[PDB]
Amino acid sequence: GSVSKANVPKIDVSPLFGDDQAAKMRVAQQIDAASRDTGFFYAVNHGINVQRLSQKTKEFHMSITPEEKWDLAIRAYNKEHQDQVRAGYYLSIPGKKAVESFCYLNPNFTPDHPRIQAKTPTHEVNVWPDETKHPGFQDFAEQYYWDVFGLSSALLKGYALALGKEENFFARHFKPDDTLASVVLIRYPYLDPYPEAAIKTAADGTKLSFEWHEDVSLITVLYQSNVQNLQVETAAGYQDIEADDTGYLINCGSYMAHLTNNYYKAPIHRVKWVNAERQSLPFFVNLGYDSVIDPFDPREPNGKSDREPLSYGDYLQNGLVSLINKNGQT
Numbered sequence: 001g002s003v004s005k006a007n008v009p010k011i012d013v014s015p016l017f018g019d020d021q022a023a024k025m026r027v028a029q030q031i032d033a034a035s036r037d038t039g040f041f042y043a044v045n046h047g048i049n050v051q052r053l054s055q056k057t058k059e060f061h062m063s064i065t066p067e068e069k070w071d072l073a074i075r076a077y078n079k080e081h082q083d084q085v086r087a088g089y090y091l092s093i094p095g096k097k098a099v100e101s102f103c104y105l106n107p108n109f110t111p112d113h114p115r116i117q118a119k120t121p122t123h124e125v126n127v128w129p130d131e132t133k134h135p136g137f138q139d140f141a142e143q144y145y146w147d148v149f150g151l152s153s154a155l156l157k158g159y160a161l162a163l164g165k166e167e168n169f170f171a172r173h174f175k176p177d178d179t180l181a182s183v184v185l186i187r188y189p190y191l192d193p194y195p196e197a198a199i200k201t202a203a204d205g206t207k208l209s210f211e212w213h214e215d216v217s218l219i220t221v222l223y224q225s226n227v228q229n230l231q232v233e234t235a236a237g238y239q240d241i242e243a244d245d246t247g248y249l250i251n252c253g254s255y256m257a258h259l260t261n262n263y264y265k266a267p268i269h270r271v272k273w274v275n276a277e278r279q280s281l282p283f284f285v286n287l288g289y290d291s292v293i294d295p296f297d298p299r300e301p302n303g304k305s306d307r308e309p310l311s312y313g314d315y316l317q318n319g320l321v322s323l324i325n326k327n328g329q330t
């Protein structure tokens with residue numbers, strides 16, 4: 001019943017920001033090898049100040065009041081906010097639900113934006129706390145969105161080259177004016193006593209905070225504090241993913257698995273229950289609402305696939321609802 005440790009290589013992604021094309025191919029090879037193995041890798045030498053990200057996120061989580069949480073709550077917690085399906089605060093439920101979080105979307109989604117004017121699903125205008133009660137928080141959060149957007153764009157060039165495509169194969173659909181990408185600022189608290197109602201038990205007996213799932217994304221670009229919790233499923237069972245609070249943990253989402261005919265799988269993973277204060281800050285790399293990538297199969301000589309091209313917006317709307325139905329309202 002022992003638990004092994006997943007091979008999660010640390011990949012220096014800095015060449016993806018430069019113009020050394022052979023060096024970028026050597027990064028792409030590493031991304032290919034990781035994507036074909038466990039499906040996770042750590043992006044290092046990424047150029048983002050993750051210490052400031054963790055400090056500002058901690059300041060926000062530890063200073064917001066129950067009044068402000070109701071005022072920012074998504075409609076799952078506040079019936080007055082029917083437009084907040086994605087963005088807003090996700091309340092914990094003491095004695096029942098430990099996790100709480102704050103999700104925000106593309107800062108360019110304003111009342112002027114045509115997708116907001118047309119009321120297209122998955123598009124929302126971000127809600128923010130009072131500036132004086134949380135000085136600099138909105139500025140930090142929006143800046144972080146574009147900081148990790150820049151990193152994610154380079155990572156997408158690595159994935160494109162790894163699959164034998166031109167480096168903009170994915171990134172050309174990843175644009176500041178229409179990206180459905182999201183940031184979630186997740187707090188997992190220390191609780192004494194920790195309520196067993198907030199703990200799930202896996203089929204193999206492991207105590208979990210969040211059950212197995214594939215990510216709803218093209219790729220996921222995640223920062224976490226230094227508390228080990230993640231497990232990836234392999235054919236030989238679940239394996240622990242070691243923590244690293246200096247790098248970004250990268251993995252493919254189910255849209256990537258669809259478009260590559262499962263050549264780059266969306267790794268199934270789950271979150272172990274750990275009674276420790278920690279943060280989990282995912283950036284879900286989503287494309288535009290009408291973004292469509294023609295599927296292909298890198299295993300076939302002609303590279304042809306019979307899978308239907310999937311519009312990303314419909315994929316995202318269906319995927320987020322299915323994840324809530326399967327693993328519960330977060």
Ligand SMILES: CC(C)[C@@H](NC(=O)[C@H](CS)NC(=O)CCC[C@H](N)C(=O)O)S(=O)(=O)O
Nearest residue numbers: 086099103182184186210215271280282330
């Ligand atoms: C329970 C929770 C803390 C987990 N984190 C996540 O983000 C999970 C697993 S990937 N994903 C979501 O809840 C989709 C969010 C989409 C976002 N609202 C949007 O609209 O884009 S946990 O894995 O850390 O346990």
Ligand SMILES: [Fe+3]
Nearest residue numbers: 213214215269
């Ligand atoms: Fe996930």
